Symmetry: C3
Subunit: 344 residues, 3 copies
C-alpha cells in the first residue's frame, strides 16, 4: 500500500508511567527497501506531565531535540561542569552522543512534548540510552561492574557504594519532581501568504545543522488551504503531523503510483526527494519537517505563479510536451494568481 506512511501506532512504547512516556518509531527500513537511505535515523517521542524530570542518562547517538509543545529546562553534563538551557516551543538543539543530560518540565499546568531525531553511527539504526539510576525497569549500569572493581574505583566499602548509588530507589525514569537552542521561527517564513506559512532552516545557515546535513521546517496552514504540487531536489523529508489533519497526495515511480493518505496528530509521512507532493489542511494545521541529505536542496513547484518550473519551458517546447498549444499551456499556468499555498 504505502511504504511511506507511519501512523502513531508504528511507535513502540519504551517506557511509560503516570508522569509521561518515551516511544520509538519503528525503523524506517523495517518493512521496506525503499527507505534504505533512512536506515541510520530513528524518531523518538517524549511526553511528560507538569513538574517532572527525565532522569540523567546519555545516548549512544547524536540527538536533535525539538520542543513540539510546552517548555523545558535541559541540562547537559560535561566532565568539567554543566550547561542549562530553557527551551520554548519551536526551539531545537543538538545533543552530541555521550553527553549525560536530564530534562525537566517546569510548568505546573502544561504538558511537555518533545520530538527526538536520532542520528546513529555506533550500531546503524540502533539507539541505546544508559541510565545512571537503578529502577524497576533496569538497574544502574554501574551495578554491572564487579564488587572489587567498584570498591577500588570509589575507594569505599561495597555496602557504602550499594546503599548510596546502586540500590533501587525510583520506580521509573520519569519522576515527579518536588551550541545553544534555536527556534524554528527565528526567521521570516520563506513562504507566506493568506493561506499559510513555511519556516525553514537549512544547514547552510545553521552550524548545528551543517554537521548533520539536515534541514528543519515548520508548516502552518489555515483549514482548507492547499500546499500545491512541488518536489524537493535532494532532501527526503520526514513530515510529522503536529496539530490538525492533512490530506496528502504523494506521487511516486516505483509504475506511476498515487499514495493518498489523511494524517492525524502524531502520524508521519516520509517524502522522498524528486517525488511530487501536495497536501491539504483539513483543519488548521501545523507540521514539522526534518529533511535529511539537505545540503543544497531546492523546492520546485509545478503550479502557482512563483517558482513554477513549468512556466519556464519555451513555448515551442511546451507545445511538443503537452496536448495544448504553447499559448494555451501558458494561459492555463497564468490562471492561479497565488503562490505556494492556495485556497483548496
Amino acid at each position: 500500500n504505502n511504504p511511506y506512511l507511519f501512523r502513531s501506532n508504528k511507535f513502540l512504547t519504551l517506557f511509560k508511567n503516570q508522569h509521561g512516556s518515551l516511544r520509538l518509531l519503528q525503523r524506517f527500513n523495517e518493512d521496506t527497501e525503499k527507505l534504505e537511505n533512512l536506515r541510520d535515523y530513528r524518531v523518538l517521542e517524549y511526553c511528560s506531565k507538569p513538574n517532572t524530570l527525565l532522569l540523567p542518562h546519555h545516548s549512544d547517538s547524536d540527538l536533535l531535540v525539538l520542543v513540539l509543545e510546552g517548555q523545558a529546562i535541559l541540562v547537559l553534563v560535561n566532565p568539567d561542569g554543566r550547561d542549562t538551557y530553557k527551551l520554548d516551543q519551536g526551539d531545537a538543539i543538538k545533543i552530541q552522543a555521550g553527553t549525560p543530560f536530564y530534562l525537566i518540565n517546569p510548568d505546573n499546568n502544561q504538558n511537555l512534548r518533545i520530538l527526538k531525531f536520532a542520528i546513529t553511527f555506533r550500531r546503524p539504526g540502533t539507539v541505546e540510552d544508559f541510565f545512571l539510576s537503578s529502577t524497576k525497569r533496569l538497574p544502574s549500569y554501574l551495578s554491572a561492574f564487579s564488587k572489587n572493581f567498584l570498591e577500588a574505583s570509589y575507594d569505599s566499602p561495597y555496602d557504602e557504594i550499594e546503599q548510596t548509588l546502586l540500590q533501587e530507589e525510583q520506580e521509573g525514569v520519569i519522576v515527579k519532581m518536588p551550541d545553544k537552542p534555536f527556534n524554528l521561527r527565528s526567521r521570516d517564513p520563506i513562504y507566506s501568504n493568506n493561506y499559510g506559512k513555511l519556516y525553514e532552516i537549512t544547514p547552510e545557515k545553521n552550524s548545528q545543522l551543517r554537521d548533520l546535513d539536515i534541514l528543519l521546517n515548520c508548516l502552518q496552514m489555515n483549514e482548507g488551504a492547499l500546499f500545491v504540487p512541488h518536489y524537493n531536489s535532494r532532501a527526503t523529508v520526514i513530515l510529522v503531523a503536529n496539530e490538525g489533519r492533512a490530506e496528502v497526495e504523494l506521487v511516486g515511480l516505483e509504475q506511476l503510483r498515487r499514495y493518498a493518505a489523511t494524517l492525524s496528530e502524531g502520524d508521519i509521512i516520509v517524502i522522498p526527494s524528486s517525488f511530487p507532493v501536495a497536501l491539504k489542511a483539513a483543519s488548521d494545521l501545523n507540521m514539522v519537517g526534518i529533511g535529511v541529505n539537505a545540503e543544497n536542496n531546492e523546492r520546485n513547484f509545478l503550479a502557482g505563479h512563483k517558482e513554477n518550473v513549468i512556466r519556464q519551458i519555451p513555448r515551442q517546447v511546451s507545445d511538443l510536451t503537452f496536448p495544448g498549444s504553447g499559448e494555451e499551456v501558458e494561459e492555463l499556468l497564468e490562471n492561479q494568481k497565488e503562490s505556494y499555498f492556495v485556497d483548496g
Copy 2:
C-alpha cells in the same frame, strides 16, 4: 568467468522508437559481490536520430552527461529561468538531481550519442525519471493528482486542465522536432607519443568533478599499439569502448587470475584499483573512462621507461626479489625505450 565485463547486451532498453533510444546498464553488483563499491552508480546510454528532442523530465539522481558522438542543445530549467548549452563531442556536464531538462539533436544528418553516468542517493542503485508528458509509455505524473487537487492548484476547471496538460499527445518521449560544459580534450594529454594519447581530468582540477570524486579520461590508440601494464592506486575505472576494438588483460587476486577479453563498440570493462591491467588496440581505438574514488589517484607502471616503479627498486633488493641479478633486472627494464604506449 569475468565479473568485470559488461557487454552491450547487459544493457536493458528503457525506451526506443524510430527516433532514438535510452538504455540502462544492469546494476554493477547485480551478479557479483566484487563490485560492491559501485552499487550507487548506473550507466545509461542515450541515442537519437537527427532533429529530435528528448521530452522534458527530471531525474532523482545527479547525472554526469558525456557526448560520445554528435552535438546537442541542452536546456536546464530552473524555477527562475533556464540555461541553454551547446554540447559538442567530448563535452561533459553535471546535471544536478531534480533539474528538469530536455535534450535536442540539432544536426540534420548526424546521430547524437550520449553516455549518462548516474550517481544515486535517494534509493541506492536506482534511477527514476519523471516525465512531464503523458505518452503511450506512461501518463504525465501530474495526472496522478486527484481532480480536486488539480483544479484548486491551477484555478481552472478539470476539463481545461485535462485537455491542456494531461491528455496523451506524443507516442513516446523522443519526438521528431520540426556550471558549464568542459571538454575531455580541453587540456594537453597526460600521456602522448607516436602510439597513443591519454587525456585526463581529475577532481583536483575541475569543480564539477570535485563534488563527485570522479575522474574522466579519453584514450585514443593507433591500431597495434599497447598501453603497458600498470594499475591505479585508488580509482576504479569504468572503461567504455567507444570506437574500435581492444584486447584487454586484467590481472586480479580473488588466487592469481587473468581475465582476458576483447571489447567491441559499446562493451564495458571495470578496472578495480590496484589490479594490474594492459590493453591492445586491435584497431584504431577510442575509449572513455570514468573513475570513481578518484581523489589523489596515481597510475603506477610496471613496464616502459617513465614512471616505471619497478625501476625504482635498489639493486640489492631487486636481486632478492627476482631470479635475475640486480644488474640483469636493470638492463631488461632498460630495453623498452618508449613510455606508456608502445608498439604491440
Copy 3:
C-alpha cells in the same frame, strides 16, 4: 557470550616460514551484527626474525603501520623514486594504498613485530597484497600477462623475461637478507600518575590521522593498577594487548550485560563508544588502542576526582537519581583522591 573479544586464535595465518609470519584477524562483523561499523577494517600482524626482508608488494588498502616491537627500515617506492624510513618501537606511519614497499628488520638479535591496521575501500572488508615476486606460494602477478603482451611491453624475448623476472626464486615472501613516522609517545601522556599513563594522538592533532578519522593511544599500567570506569563518546576502540595481562569489564546494553574477560598478549577487545569500561592490570601492562570514528571524541569518567561527570550533577538532582542523599552521593564521590588510574 562476548561478541567483542578476539583472542589471538581468531587470527588466520596468511604466510609463515622460519623467518617470520603474517596473520590476518577475522572480519569484525564475521560472527556478529554488532560490529557493523567496523566492517571496512582489518587487523594484520607481521612478525619477522632478525635480518629479514618482506619482499616488495603493494596493498589494495591504506595501511596504518605500528611498530609494536623491534625496529625496521621501511622503503616506499614511487614512480619517480623512493623514501626510506627508519622506524622505532612506537612509531606509526600511514602507507597509502597502491604504494609498493618492502620491510627490513635490520637488527641482528631482536625480532620485529608490526601491527597493520587496514582501511579498505575497493572491496569492503577485503585486503589483497600483490607481490612482485614468484614464490612457491604464488607466482609473480606479472606472469599472468600473456607472452605477447610481456614481450611487447619490455621489448625483449620471452625467454629473457621469464629467466630474469618470472621464474621462481625465493621460497616465500620473507627472506633472510644477507608523510613521515610519528611516535605514540611523541607527546606528554594525557593521563599520568603513580599507577599508569595514557598517551593519545587524535586526528585533530596529526595530519596522517585526520584523513582516516582515527586516534591512537598507548596505555601503560603498573601491575595491580585500575583504569576506572569511563566511556568514549564517539570512538570505538580496538584494544590490543601488547605486553602483560588485563582483566577487563565492559558494560553494554544489547539488556544490561557485563562482558568480563582476561586478555593475554595478542588478545584483542573492541570497546564500542558509549559502553562503560574498566580494566585491571594483572601484570605490568602495555596496550595499544586504535579508535575509529575518532574526531571530537571525549572520554567521560564515572569515578575518581578529575573529569568525573557524576560529580557535576546538582545535588537536588543527584538526590532524585540515586538512593542516597545529595550530600551522601557527593561525599562518596569525594572518597577517591586519585584520577584515571588507581590502586586496584
